[PDB]
Design a binder for this molecule. Structure first.
Ligand SMILES: Nc1ccn([C@H]2C[C@H](O)[C@@H](COP(=O)(O)OP(=O)(O)OP(=O)(O)O)O2)c(=O)n1
Ligand SMILES: [Ca+2]
Ligand SMILES: [Ca+2]
Length: 430
DNA sequence: TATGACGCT
DNA sequence: AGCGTCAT
């Protein structure tokens, strides 16, 4: 009863940039602003594959992982920006550099966990305690939360979406609990005020807009962030969880959007995250293993302990390129030349990482996919990485894969390779 | 039809 | 060490 721990100890936020690559291209070319546009890789085959879509283009049905030519059928006016192409492949430097712009601003407020190229988690527990000590005992104005949604509000006893927002926000604040410095709901509100500021700083200093979620753990923050995209942040309180989860498809919770989540649905015979509450921890552990059972048991109650790991920099640096279908590499000269092209971009990126971040990678991993193989990776081998030389790395990458060539005729290469991937890991300080 | 983090064995 | 899962 009192020994019920409710996972309200932390204040955690997930910040995520709205249509990130599109914003980056639109800062650079003002003509793309406020217009249906998408970002594509390559152009010859079907106009290129789309990887990012503005919200105006989304109104027409334009999605990621779609050919530009098909996109132009749903949206004739759609504008396109192309990813920079280097050494025969896509080069994403523009977007990685835009990312450190954002991560460095976010780092001044709290320590972040780089989660992707455009999203970071933030643990605001410490920042919130201090704000509570400066706001003495004085209340929190709705003017401090100009873009915040309180999930599940308004409730109880105006039909444009901004009027709703203030109604729920007023309800939340007018019932707030400012006399207690340990009230979890008051802490989420202070965290939300901090994130409004974080988000105004990112836009002030990059011109990029984002959404955020604020709650007690990474999972809820992440789910919360997506409730009011774009350019809005959503506070998900501990108390909103039973209603929020009662109709939430299990696949929507982070790590349940794949196979494990599908077997939760098929085995247990449920649909929504809330239905998990009727199962005991021992039942769940028998169904899915000690780790999954324990984590499933806590999570449907809104409790999750996976911490915000202080890590602003990737553990891994890698380049890949698919050669699907008839483009599959089928000679020794092809395989070596693309390994060289990949090795060359990787060396460009590693030298920059060494100067910037005072570290060197020590292991090189070569992954390949042969033609006729449902698995995304067919083979993965590693060797030492001792000089940032592209000709050595491509040589070593070949040496460790050459054994995979079926063909007895030595000049050709079978089975044809549909994918090459070089990857620098095992960093050491420098 | 380009990337990164982590678990399991 | 190497494969599998889950995500942006
Ligand atoms: N399968 C993917 C997913 C993402 N990205 C890149 C392009 C995106 O712009 C960026 C961030 O991905 P998101 O999943 O956050 O989606 P967006 O940021 O594009 O838009 P939004 O978050 O508003 O949906 O990462 C990619 O190249 N391939
Ligand atoms: Ca995003
Ligand atoms: Ca994202």
């Amino acid at each position: 009863g009192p020994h019920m721990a409710t996972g309200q100890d932390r204040v955690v936020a997930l910040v995520d940039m709205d249509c990130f690559f599109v914003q980056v291209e639109q800062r650079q070319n003002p003509h793309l602003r406020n217009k249906p546009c998408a970002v594509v890789q390559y152009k010859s085959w079907k106009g290129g594959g789309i990887i990012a879509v503005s919200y105006e283009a989304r109104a027409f049905g334009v999605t990621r992982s779609m050919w530009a030519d098909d996109a132009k059928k749903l949206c004739p006016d759609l504008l396109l920006a192309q990813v920079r192409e280097s050494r025969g492949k896509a080069n994403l430097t523009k977007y990685r550099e835009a990312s450190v712009e954002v991560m460095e601003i976010m780092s001044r407020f709290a320590v972040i966990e780089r989660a992707s190229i455009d999203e970071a988690y933030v643990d605001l527990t410490s920042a919130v305690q201090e704000r509570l000590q400066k706001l003495q005992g004085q209340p929190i104005s709705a003017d401090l939360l100009p873009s915040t949604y309180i999930e599940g509000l308004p409730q109880g006893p105006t039909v444009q979406k901004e009027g709703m927002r203030k109604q729920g926000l007023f309800q939340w604040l007018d019932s707030l609990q400012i006399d207690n410095l340990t009230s979890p709901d008051l802490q989420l509100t202070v965290g939300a005020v901090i994130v409004e500021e974080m988000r105004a700083a990112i836009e002030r200093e990059t011109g990029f807009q984002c959404s955020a979620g604020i709650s007690h753990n990474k999972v809820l923050a992440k789910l919360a962030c997506g409730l009011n995209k774009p350019n809005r942040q959503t506070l998900v309180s501990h108390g909103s969880v039973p209603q929020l989860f009662s109709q939430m498809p299990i696949r929507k919770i982070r790590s349940l959007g794949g196979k494990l989540g599908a077997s939760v649905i098929e085995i247990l015979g449920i649909e929504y995250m809330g239905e998990l509450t009727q199962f005991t921890e021992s039942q769940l552990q028998s169904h899915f293993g000690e780790k999954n059972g324990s984590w499933l048991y806590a999570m449907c109650r809104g409790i999750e302990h996976d911490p915000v790991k202080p890590r602003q920099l990737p553990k891994t640096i890698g380049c890949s390129k698919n050669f699907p279908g008839k483009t599959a590499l089928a000679t020794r000269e092809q395989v070596q030349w693309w390994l060289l092209q990949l090795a060359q971009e990787l060396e460009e990126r590693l030298t920059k990482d060494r100067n910037d971040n005072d570290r060197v990678a020590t292991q090189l991993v070569v992954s390949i996919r042969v033609q006729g193989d449902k698995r995304l990776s067919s083979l993965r081998r590693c060797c030492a990485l001792t000089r940032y030389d592209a000709h050595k790395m491509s040589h070593d990458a070949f040496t460790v894969i050459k054994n995979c060539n079926t063909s007895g005729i030595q000049t050709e290469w079978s089975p044809p390779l549909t994918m090459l991937f070089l990857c620098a890991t095992k960093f050491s300080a420098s």
